[PDB]
Design a protein around this nucleic acid. Structure first.
Ligand code: D3T
Ligand code: MG
Ligand code: NA
Ligand code: NA
Length: 324
DNA sequence: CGGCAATACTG
DNA sequence: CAGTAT
DNA sequence: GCCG
């Protein structure tokens, strides 16, 4: 909700991110993800330090954007950054691949297309490069969720289908469509991916598969590309997860996010000797001196999302209140 | 000093 | 496993 | 980067 001083920081955060300095980029993310949820412009160095997420190092940079109106750090960002960002926006390519391609002399998508060795996923990502950078209106996301739900309830009307992610958080636009599928009887959700996916392929709704371990009967997620019928339609990313009714609440909480919200909640659980994943909320978890899990602990009953919050000693938050 | 979420595929 | 993804 |  404020301080365009962040637009200068966002640039650095993205630079460190594409370059692989993930932890540093996370630090900037939180500092920025904070300078927004805040209220008044920061006018003092000590007034910065006071904000949770901002430190002495960050404050000194927040003073050069006000006292000087410009951050000199941006003037020394590697010329490789724009290219690394270009490359890492290819679905399936991350910082490691982008850096490798850059080191190999590649500088444009034309270079990637004609000379780079692409994985199957990356070839799909490049083929839909522009489309994958666009967000769809939530109205279209509804159409996509309904298309999957109809095909699902087609072979089992008992299947519960819910659109999660940014859609459930009530955003105006959606990057992809995240559909969670389960079954109230807690058993019939058995290997339905085969039937659902082949049904969606049957009607030409699915165009490309990115992640889909279909040889496996334990498949949990399907990440792919779909496109609604008619003219003026673009390819949209689709992410579907089938979960046992037993893990419905945690799966719903997870898939709804946001990402930063999930990380915050999971971090809280850890401080309480507990653990949260899309599968369950556990207590009495044993972790070594490195926060690594050594002992599983006990799964706690979590029939509903509110239960998870309750068990964590947190007040319930509607999906729209989790848009962190 | 050293964690910063916890998990699922791919090859 | 590393890399990438949610 | 931040912070316990
Ligand atoms: C990326 C990521 C995501 N999640 C969860 C929580 C969100 C859902 C859906 O992710 P998505 O990227 O579609 O996000 P979404 O919120 O739907 O935003 P878009 O509208 O799709 O961009 O997955 C997570 O726990 N950790 C992560 O690192
Ligand atoms: Mg989404
Ligand atoms: Na990418
Ligand atoms: Na497959």
């Amino acid at each position: 909700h404020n301080l365009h001083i962040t637009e200068k920081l966002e640039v650095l955060a993205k630079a460190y991110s594409v370059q692989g300095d993930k932890w540093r980029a996370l630090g900037y993310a939180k500092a920025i993800n904070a300078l927004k949820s805040f209220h008044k412009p920061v006018t003092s160095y000590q007034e910065a330090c006071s904000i949770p997420g901002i430190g002495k190092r960050m404050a000194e940079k927040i003073i050069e954007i006000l006292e000087s109106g410009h951050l000199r750090k941006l003037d020394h960002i590697s010329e490789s950054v724009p290219v690394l960002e270009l490359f890492s926006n290819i679905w399936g390519a991350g910082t490691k691949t982008a850096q490798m391609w850059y080191q190999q002399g590649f500088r444009s998508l034309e270079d990637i297309r004609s000379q780079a060795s692409l994985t199957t996923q990356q070839a799909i990502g490049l083929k839909h490069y522009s489309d994958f950078l666009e967000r769809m209106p939530r109205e279209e996301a509804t159409e996509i969720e309904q298309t999957v739900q109809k095909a699902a309830q087609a072979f089992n009307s008992g299947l519960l289908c819910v659109a999660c992610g940014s859609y459930r958080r009530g955003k105006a636009t959606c990057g992809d469509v995240d559909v969670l599928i389960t079954h109230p009887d807690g058993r019939s959700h058995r290997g339905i991916f085969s039937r659902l996916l082949d049904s969606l392929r049957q009607e030409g709704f699915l165009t490309d598969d990115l992640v889909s371990q279909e040889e496996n009967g334990q498949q949990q997620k399907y990440l792919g590309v779909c496109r609604l019928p008619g003219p003026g339609r673009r390819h949209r990313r689709l992410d579907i997860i089938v979960v046992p009714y037993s893990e419905f609440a945690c799966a719903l909480l997870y898939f709804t996010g946001s990402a930063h919200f999930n990380r915050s909640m999971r971090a809280l659980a850890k401080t309480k000797g507990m653990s949260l994943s899309e599968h369950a909320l556990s207590t009495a978890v044993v972790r070594n001196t490195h926060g690594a899990k050594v002992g599983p602990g006990r799964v706690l009953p979590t029939p509903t999302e509110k239960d998870v919050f309750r068990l964590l000693g947190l007040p319930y938050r509607e999906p729209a209140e989790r848009d962190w």
